[PDB]
Design a protein around this nucleic acid. Structure first.
Lengths: 89, 64, 457
RNA sequence: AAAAAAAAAAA
RNA sequence: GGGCUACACACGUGCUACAAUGGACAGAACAAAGGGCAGCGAAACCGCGAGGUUAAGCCAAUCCCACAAAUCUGUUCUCAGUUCGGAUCGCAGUCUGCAACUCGACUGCGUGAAGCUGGAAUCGCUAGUAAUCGCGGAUCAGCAUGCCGCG
RNA sequence: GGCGACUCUCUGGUCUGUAACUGACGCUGAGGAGCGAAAGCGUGGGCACGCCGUAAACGAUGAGUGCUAAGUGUUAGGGGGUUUCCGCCCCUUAGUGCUGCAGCUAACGCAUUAAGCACUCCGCCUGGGGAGUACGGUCGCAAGACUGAAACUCAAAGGAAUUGAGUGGAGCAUGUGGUUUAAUUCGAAGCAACGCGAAGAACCUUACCAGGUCUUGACAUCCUCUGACAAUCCUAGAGAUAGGACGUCCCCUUCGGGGGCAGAGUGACAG
């Protein structure tokens, strides 16, 4: 998606330097978003962020997105994150 | 440590026996606590009365 | 008694003298009688009290040469200037000098005078409260003023940087009373260039305390009642307006970015109940004082830059090239095309956008996205320039009652210019401390702004 | 990047 | 012999949890640095396993240490004090020293605990900051939540 | 309610005994009686002595009895077996803590000293405010104490829990504690001491103690001296401590004698 926001979201999701896990979650989540909406995942994601200093705005946006996604009920993180983005949007 | 009186089998402490009592008073003449002399509770009490009787008859000092 | 004290002092002044105990002094003086020993002890105590000898931590006597508290300080500070403090200060008490502030302001930092010269240039005097005189380095109030870093202006109250007894009293440039100042006097030509300047210590006596409201009514509303009331000052106010316009035109021609955003002002009553929420307007009188404080600040910063001594600057770095690239793409959607590249934008190119969006529906948002693309200004020991003001040299000098950086600037002025102390050890001392002071005070400023906004919201 | 200030500054 | 390994009852400091970005449980790997002659020790090697075993090559780009792991992959478990992660306590073997008793390491093997994220504290911050994962060596009978240097 | 320097005089209660006797002779007790901080009051005193009787004197757990895991101190005795004993260690009562199961609790907790499971008896409560007030009191010397309203007013009031108003904590290490000990060696004792040592406490380390000990000693400087020094098996022991057997060659001699290892004694001293 050639997006620094995506890359930053991956870093917020990453635990114990396990960047691969977080990359996989995000790409799978973005697939779930495309399969439900039909819209481009990136477009939905940016809409989500809009609703959630400029650098600190993104920081807080991504931090909350991830923090609340983790608290959701759905079983996998890719679905939790997808649903939190879809809700945010 | 061990109780002097239970050890040596001394049932009766005597206020006249100054030399014995003097083992249980400090340099200043204060009655040494049970924890420091290893004395039995039973004999601490008998000992305390003996020392006080001794002090009264000027066998031991109140204050050195 | 005195002859004995002199003899003891003479003995201790000898080149071969080493710090001795009382017993070693007894032996060395051949004191054998108990009455002479008593005299020695009395002499040592009396000489130690007078500070002519010092007892060490090892009870040896030696020659010195050869070797709540903030509120107490505030309460001990005199409410009037001492005659001794007038020494080496320029007397300006007979000049027409005014303060121009908010009606509610009690902490008056700055006073101004403008004289038009025969050649058509202007002489601008900016006279700032000499807070550095009363708040000395490492004093209880100084340590607290560092910890606070700035005054905080909440909706209903002010948390002051220094105790109110000083801020509203002897430091405030109160009307028609003698006040100590650090002054910046500037000769300014018809193009707003400072041709000559002098930074010095002075004593002033303000002619009048004016308000921004009163000065606007005189200059803009053409109010005849207020002009008659302040008739002697009206000519000076008209010359101040003209000079401020010349300085503003120069600042805008240099390519400064005029960030004129509509801010809210919450209006409360004396009980702190909310009466109204209004737009904060910047009037002609505020903008006039702004230009005078700006040129004083630039002049002081430039002077110290060329002196090449450790100093504190108010810097605003170049915008982040990626954020600015996104902004340039954004304004292109509205049909605004900017001349330049994100890695080498001149401030003037951004100002040209603000001028083009003025009175347009898209103004507020282009303005807001432009701000978000800029960096925050901060304090720094390095003169890195001030992007938003389009200047190479900028510091804060003009508000030492409420900003600790200005108080430091005043101390550095006193150290380097007035006292002439430009030695290596003095420079090293300041070069070491200024980074920490700059970081801390920049942090305290952000903390204040975040709290002020939090009370507004 | 539509809702914004933070930072110009105001002072 | 004992104890410093108590442990009444503190702090500093260090590891293992508070799963799912993870537990099983298979399949595919990708590291550097450091060491070895009285040794380093392969195959095959006992072994449920832990240890023994005999012996090649190397005296070190030629042998051995030596298989980095984390990770990818499906199979579960499936939000459950659990397929959370591991305490503890039975009971089971293997080494070593003089002998594991106070007071070893390891595995066999039940039990599977706490814990489902700790106020004040007091830092900093993008590649392996970091954090995770390691890994080797020293030391050294035994054996590092220590430590050193290196991935 | 409360009692502490000591002695004597007079006199309560309790426990362990034990088993002789008595043979249910018991229990709770409204009333009543006495006792009852302090203070106040009263008189001679700066205390005695009377009223007055309340108080976190309820003390927020009435009294008695039976039944129902534990593990440990502390006070006073008794029983047993290493034990004269000393001294440990178990068994049992009485008092007094501590941590906990059953069960019980709204929760907090209680827990054989129950707030568990039971029986008997006595005191008490049935919203709050008004109100311990009113009023008759009754007791006093008096203050008060004592008994105890209602109209009216208000949907609440109240209890517990509550959660607020990087590292910590969860589980196991370590090091200096402290404490438990005969000894638990410390230096260091922020800095480097508090994973730190020493790069490895089972042992040695290890200091320090509890015991066995030896003594130019564990051993040197010595020396003069001479046997090499010993190895080794046996005896012991926890080994030291070694005692024996047996086994030893002085190093080197221009050969005067001086000299290994030191037997050997040596002698200030050993370290």
């Amino acid at each position: 998606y050639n997006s620094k926001l995506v890359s930053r979201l991956i870093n917020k999701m990453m635990i114990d330097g396990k960047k691969g896990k977080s990359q996989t979650i995000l790409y799978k989540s973005f697939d779930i978003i495309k399969e439900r909406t039909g819209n481009d995942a990136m477009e939905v994601f940016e809409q989500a962020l809009k609703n959630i200093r400029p650098e600190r705005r993104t920081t807080l946006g991504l931090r909350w997105l991830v923090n609340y996604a983790r608290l959701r009920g759905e079983k996998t993180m890719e679905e939790r994150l997808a649903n939190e983005i879809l809700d945010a949007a | 440590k061990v109780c002097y009186f239970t050890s040596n089998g001394i049932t009766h402490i005597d206020y006249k026996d100054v030399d014995l009592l003097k083992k249980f008073v400090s340099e200043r003449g204060k009655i040494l606590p049970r924890r420091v002399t290893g004395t039995n509770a039973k004999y601490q009490r008998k000992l305390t009365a003996a020392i006080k009787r001794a002090r009264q008859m000027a066998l031991l000092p109140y204050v050195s | 008694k005195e002859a004995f004290m002199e003899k003891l002092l003479s003995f201790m002044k000898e080149e071969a003298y080493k710090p001795l105990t009382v017993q070693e002094l007894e032996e060395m003086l051949n004191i054998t009688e108990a009455e002479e020993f008593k005299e020695l002890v009395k002499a040592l105590v009396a000489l130690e009290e007078k500070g002519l000898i010092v007892r060490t931590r090892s009870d040896r006597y030696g020659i010195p040469e050869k070797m709540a508290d903030a509120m107490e300080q505030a309460s001990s500070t005199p409410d009037t200037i001492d005659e001794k403090d007038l020494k080496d200060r320029r007397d300006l008490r007979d000049q027409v000098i005014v303060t121009i502030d908010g009606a509610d302001a009690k902490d008056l930092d700055d006073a101004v005078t403008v004289t038009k010269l025969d050649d058509g240039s202007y002489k601008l005097g900016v006279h700032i409260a000499d807070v550095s005189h009363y708040v000395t380095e490492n004093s209880p109030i100084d340590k607290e003023a560092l910890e606070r870093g700035t005054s905080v202006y909440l909706v209903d109250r002010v948390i002051p940087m220094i105790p109110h007894r000083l801020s509203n009293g002897i430091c405030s440039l109160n009307p028609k009373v003698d006040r100590l100042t650090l002054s910046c006097e500037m000769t300014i030509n018809s193009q707003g260039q400072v041709t000559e300047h002098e930074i010095f210590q002075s004593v002033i006596k303000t002619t009048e305390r004016m308000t921004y409201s009163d000065v606007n009514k005189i200059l803009v509303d053409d109010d005849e009642e207020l002009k008659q009331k302040y008739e002697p000052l009206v000519p000076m106010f008209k010359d101040m307006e003209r000079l401020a316009q010349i300085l503003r035109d120069k600042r805008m021609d240099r390519g400064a970015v005029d960030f004129d955003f509509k801010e809210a002002k919450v209006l409360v009553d004396d009980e702190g109940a909310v009466k109204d929420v209004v737009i904060r307007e910047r009037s002609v009188a505020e903008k006039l004082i702004e230009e005078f404080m700006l040129v004083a600040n630039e002049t002081v910063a430039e002077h110290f830059h060329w002196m090449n001594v450790p100093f504190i600057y108010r810097i605003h770095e170049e915008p982040n090239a990626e954020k600015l690239q996104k902004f340039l793409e954004f304004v292109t959607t509205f049909g605004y095309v900017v001349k330049g590249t994100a890695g080498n934008i001149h401030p003037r190119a951004l100002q040209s956008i603000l001028d083009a969006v003025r009175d347009r529906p898209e103004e507020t948002v282009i303005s807001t996205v432009m701000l978000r693309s800029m960096k925050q200004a901060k304090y720094d020991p390095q003169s890195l320039g001030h992007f938003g003001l389009s200047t190479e040299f900028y510091t804060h000098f003009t508000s030492p009652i409420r900003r600790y950086p200005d108080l430091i600037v005043h101390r550095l002025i006193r150290t380097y210019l007035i006292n002439g102390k430009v030695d290596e050890a003095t420079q090293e001392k300041w070069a070491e401390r200024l980074p920490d002071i700059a970081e801390h005070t920049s942090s305290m400023e952000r903390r204040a702004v975040d709290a002020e906004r939090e009370t507004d919201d």
